[PDB]
Amino acid sequence: IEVLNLVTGPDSITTIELYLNTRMGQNDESKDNYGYSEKVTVANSSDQDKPTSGEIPTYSTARINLPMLNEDLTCNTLTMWEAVSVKTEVVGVSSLVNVHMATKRMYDDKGIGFPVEGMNFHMFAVGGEPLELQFLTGNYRTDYSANDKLVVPPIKHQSTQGLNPHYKQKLTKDGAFPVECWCPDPSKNENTRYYGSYTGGQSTPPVLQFTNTVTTVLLDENGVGPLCKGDGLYVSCCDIVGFLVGKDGDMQYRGLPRYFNILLRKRTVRN
Amino acid sequence: IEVLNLVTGPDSITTIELYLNTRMGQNDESKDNYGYSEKVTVANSSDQDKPTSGEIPTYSTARINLPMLNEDLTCNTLTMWEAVSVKTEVVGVSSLVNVHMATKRMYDDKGIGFPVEGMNFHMFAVGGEPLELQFLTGNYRTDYSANDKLVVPPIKHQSTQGLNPHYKQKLTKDGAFPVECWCPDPSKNENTRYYGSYTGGQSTPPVLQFTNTVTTVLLDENGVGPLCKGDGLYVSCCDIVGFLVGKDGDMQYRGLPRYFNILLRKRTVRN
Amino acid sequence: IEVLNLVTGSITTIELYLNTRMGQNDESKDNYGYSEKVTVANSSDQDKPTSGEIPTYSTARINLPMLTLTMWEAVSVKTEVVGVSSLVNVHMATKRMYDDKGIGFPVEGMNFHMFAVGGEPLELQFLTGNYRTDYSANDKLVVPPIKHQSTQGLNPHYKQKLTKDGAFPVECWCPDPSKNENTRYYGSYTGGQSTPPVLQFTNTVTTVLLDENGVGPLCKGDGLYVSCCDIVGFLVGKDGDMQYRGLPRYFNILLRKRTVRN
Amino acid sequence: IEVLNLVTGPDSITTIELYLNTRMGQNDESKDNYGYSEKVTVANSSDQDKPTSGEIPTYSTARINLPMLNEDNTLTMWEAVSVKTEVVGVSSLVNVHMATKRMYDDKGIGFPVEGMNFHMFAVGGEPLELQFLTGNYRTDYSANDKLVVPPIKHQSTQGLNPHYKQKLTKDGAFPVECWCPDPSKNENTRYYGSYTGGQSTPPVLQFTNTVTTVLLDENGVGPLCKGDGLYVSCCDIVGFLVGKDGDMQYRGLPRYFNILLRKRTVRN
Amino acid sequence: GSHIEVLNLVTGPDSITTIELYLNTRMGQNDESKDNYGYSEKVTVANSSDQDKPTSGEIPTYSTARINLPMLNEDLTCNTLTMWEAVSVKTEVVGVSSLVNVHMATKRMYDDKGIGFPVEGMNFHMFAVGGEPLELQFLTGNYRTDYSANDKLVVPPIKHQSTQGLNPHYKQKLTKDGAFPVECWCPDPSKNENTRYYGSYTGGQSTPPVLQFTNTVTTVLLDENGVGPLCKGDGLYVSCCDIVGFLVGKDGDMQYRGLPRYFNILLRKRTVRN
Ligand SMILES: CC(=O)N[C@H]1[C@H](O[C@@H]2[C@H](O[C@]3(C(=O)O)C[C@H](O)[C@@H](NC(C)=O)[C@H]([C@H](O)[C@H](O)CO)O3)[C@@H](O)[C@H](O[C@H]3[C@H](O)[C@@H](O)[C@H](O)O[C@@H]3CO)O[C@@H]2CO)O[C@H](CO)[C@H](O)[C@@H]1O[C@@H]1O[C@H](CO)[C@H](O)[C@H](O)[C@H]1O
Ligand SMILES: CC(=O)N[C@H]1[C@H](O[C@@H]2[C@H](O[C@]3(C(=O)O)C[C@H](O)[C@@H](NC(C)=O)[C@H]([C@H](O)[C@H](O)CO)O3)[C@@H](O)[C@H](O[C@H]3[C@H](O)[C@@H](O)[C@H](O)O[C@@H]3CO)O[C@@H]2CO)O[C@H](CO)[C@H](O)[C@@H]1O[C@@H]1O[C@H](CO)[C@H](O)[C@H](O)[C@H]1O
Ligand SMILES: CC(=O)N[C@H]1[C@H](O[C@@H]2[C@H](O[C@]3(C(=O)O)C[C@H](O)[C@@H](NC(C)=O)[C@H]([C@H](O)[C@H](O)CO)O3)[C@@H](O)[C@H](O)O[C@@H]2CO)O[C@H](CO)[C@H](O)[C@@H]1O
Ligand SMILES: CC(=O)N[C@H]1[C@H](O[C@@H]2[C@H](O[C@]3(C(=O)O)C[C@H](O)[C@@H](NC(C)=O)[C@H]([C@H](O)[C@H](O)CO)O3)[C@@H](O)[C@H](O)O[C@@H]2CO)O[C@H](CO)[C@H](O)[C@@H]1O
Ligand SMILES: CC(=O)N[C@H]1[C@H]([C@H](O)[C@H](O)CO)O[C@@](O)(C(=O)O)C[C@@H]1O
**Three-state SS annotation for chain A:** CCEEEECCCCCCEEEEEEEECCCCCCCCCCCCCCCECCCCCCCCCHHHCCCCCCCCCECEEEEEECCCCCCCCCCCEEEEEEEEEEEEEECCHHHHCCCCCCCCECCCCCCCECCCECCEEEEEEEECCCCEEEECCCCCCCCCCCCCCCCCCCCCCHHHHCCCCCCEEECCCCCCCECCCEEECCCCCCCEEEEEEEECCCCCCCEEEEECCCCEECCCCCCCCCECHHHEEEEEEEEEEEEEECCCCCEEEEECCEEEEEEEEEEEEEC
- What is the distance between the alpha carbons of residues C42 and C64, in angstroms, rounded to a whole number? 48
Q: Could you tell me if B143 lies within 8 Å of chain A, comparing CB atoms?
A: no
- Ligand 1 atom index nearest CA of A51: 21
Report yes or no on chains B and D touching (3+ CB pairs under 8 A): no
Helix (H) or strand (E) holding B207, with range, is strand B207-211
From residue A195, how far is each of A131, A259, D214 by CA, in Å? 12, 15, 20
Ligand 2 binding pocket mutation candidate from D37, D41, D244 (most atoms within 8 A of CB): D41
Alpha-carbon distance C84 to nearest alpha carbon in chain E (angstroms): 7
Ligand nearest to the CA of E102: 2
From residue D69, how far is each of A192, D1, D62, D222, D264 by CA, in Å? 34, 16, 20, 17, 10
Ligand 1 binding pocket mutation candidate from A41, A46, A142 (most atoms within 8 A of CB): A41
Residue E224 in contact with ligand 2 by CB distance below 6 A: no
E48 SS3 class? coil
Q: Could you tell me if E98 lies within 8 Å of chain D, comparing CB atoms?
A: yes
- What is the distance between the alpha carbons of residues A241 and D258, in angstroms, rounded to a whole number? 32
E251 SS3 class? coil
Alpha-carbon distance A175 to nearest alpha carbon in chain B (angstroms): 14
Which of B26, B94, B114 to substitute to test the interface with C, most C CBs within 10 Å?
A: B94
Cβ distance of B111 and C38 shorter than 8 Å: yes
Closest-CA residue of chain E to C80: E189
- Collect all residues of chain E within an 8 Å Cβ-Cβ radius of residue D165: none
Q: Would you call A121 exposed, middle or buried from its count of C-beta atoms within 10 A (0-12, 13-18, 19+)?
A: buried
- What is the distance between the alpha carbons of residues B77 and B74, in angstroms, rounded to a whole number? 8
Residue type, C144: P
Residue type, E235: G
Alpha-carbon distance E207 to nearest alpha carbon in chain D (angstroms): 6
Phi, psi (rounded to 5 degrees) for D227: 60, 25
Which of D57, D42, D37 minimizes the C-alpha distance to D174? D57
Ligand nearest to the CA of E183: 4
Helix (H) or strand (E) holding B16, with range, is strand B13-20
Residue D142 in contact with ligand 2 by CB distance below 6 A: no
Which of A6, A3, A19, A31 minimizes the C-alpha distance to A261? A19
Longest dimension (CA), chain D: 75
Strand partners of residue E272: E6, E81
Ligand 1 centroid to residue D99 C-alpha, Å = 14
- What is the distance between the alpha carbons of residues A214 and C126, in angstroms, rounded to a whole number? 36
Residue A11, number of CB atoms within 10 A of its CB = 8
Q: Is residue D37 marked as binding?
A: no
Kindly state the DSSP code that residue D94 receives in the 8-state scheme. Answer: -
Q: Could you tell me if A193 lies within 8 Å of chain D, comparing CB atoms?
A: yes
Cβ distance of D88 and A186 shorter than 8 Å: yes
Residue type, B75: C
Q: What is the dihedral of CA A23, A26, A31, A33, to 10 degrees?
A: -100
Cβ pair D232, D18 in contact under 8 A: yes
Phi, psi (rounded to 5 degrees) for E34: -105, 155
From residue E80, how far is each of D83, E15, E86 by CA, in Å? 49, 16, 19
Protein residue with least CA distance to atom 38, ligand 3: B44
Cβ pair E167, C27 in contact under 8 A: yes
- What is the distance between the alpha carbons of residues B35 and C150, in angstroms, rounded to a whole number? 9
From residue E82, how far is each of C124, C150, E4, E221, E230 by CA, in Å? 53, 68, 11, 18, 10
CA-angle at A31, arms to A27 and A35, nearest 5°: 40
Determination technique for this entry: X-ray
Strand partners of residue E218: none
- What is the distance between the alpha carbons of residues D251 and D24, in angstroms, rounded to a whole number? 7
Cβ pair B36, B4 in contact under 8 A: no
CA-angle at E89, arms to E88 and E94, nearest 5°: 170
Which of E101, E125, E250, E266 to substitute to test the interface with D, most D CBs within 10 Å?
A: E101
Cβ distance of A200 and D251 shorter than 8 Å: no
How many alpha carbons lie under 13 Å from residue B230 in its C-beta half-sphere? 8
- What is the distance between the alpha carbons of residues A191 and C130, in angstroms, rounded to a whole number? 58
- What is the sign, positive or negative, of the torsion defined by CA atoms of A105, A106, A112, A116? negative
D250 SS3 class? strand
Q: Which residues line ligand 4 (CB under 6 A)?
A: C 91; E 44-47, 51-55
- What is the distance between the alpha carbons of residues C232 and C218, in angstroms, rounded to a whole number? 31
Cβ pair E238, E110 in contact under 8 A: no
Ligand 3 centroid to residue B243 C-alpha, Å = 20
C152 SS3 class? helix
Strand partners of residue C248: none
- Ligand 3 atom index nearest CA of A105: 29
- Strands E261-273, E123-130: pairing is unpaired
Which of B122, B120, B93 minimizes the C-alpha distance to B209? B93
Protein residue with least CA distance to atom 8, ligand 3: B44
Phi, psi (rounded to 5 degrees) for A267: -125, 130
Name residues whose C-beta falls within 8 Å of residue B41's C-beta, 6 or more positions apart in sequence. Answer: A100, B51, B52, B55
- Ligand 5 atom index nearest CA of B109: 12
- Ligand 1 atom index nearest CA of D98: 21
Q: Which bin fits D172, alpha (ψ -120 to 50), beta or left (φ > 0)?
A: left
Q: Which bin fits A252, alpha (ψ -120 to 50), beta or left (φ > 0)?
A: beta
- What is the distance between the alpha carbons of residues A251 and C24, in angstroms, rounded to a whole number? 49
Residue A87 in contact with ligand 1 by CB distance below 6 A: no
Which of E270, E133, E267, E240 minimizes the C-alpha distance to E192? E133
Residues 35-94 of D with CB under 8 A from A: 35-36, 86, 88-94
Which of A124, A147, A150 minimizes the C-alpha distance to A216? A124
Report the Cα D236 to chain-centroid distance in Å: 7
Report the Cα C166 to chain-centroid distance in Å: 9
- Strands B120-127, B192-199: pairing is antiparallel
Kindly state the DSSP code that residue E178 receives in the 8-state scheme. Answer: T
- What is the sign, positive or negative, of the torsion defined by CA atoms of C143, C145, C149, C150? negative
Report yes or no on chains E and A touching (3+ CB pairs under 8 A): no
Report yes or no on chains B and E touching (3+ CB pairs under 8 A): no
The full DSSP string for C176-193 is -TTS-TTEEEEEEEE-SS
Phi, psi (rounded to 5 degrees) for B119: -50, 130
Cβ distance of E167 and C33 shorter than 8 Å: no
Residue type, D59: Y
Cβ distance of D210 and A220 shorter than 8 Å: yes
Cβ pair A262, A65 in contact under 8 A: no
Strands (E), E140-181: 171-173
Q: Could you give all domains of chain A from N- to C-terminal order, each with its CATH number?
A: 1-271 (2.60.175.10)
Closest-CA residue of chain B to A101: B43
Cβ pair C24, C37 in contact under 8 A: no
- What is the sign, positive or negative, of the torsion defined by CA atoms of E111, E115, E116, E120? negative
Name residues whose C-beta falls within 8 Å of residue E94's C-beta, 6 or more positions apart in sequence. Answer: D131, D133, D160, D180, D183, E22, E213, E259, E260, E261, E262
Helix (H) or strand (E) holding D20, with range, is strand D13-20
Given C44, C149, C236, which is nearest B29 (Cβ)? Answer: C149
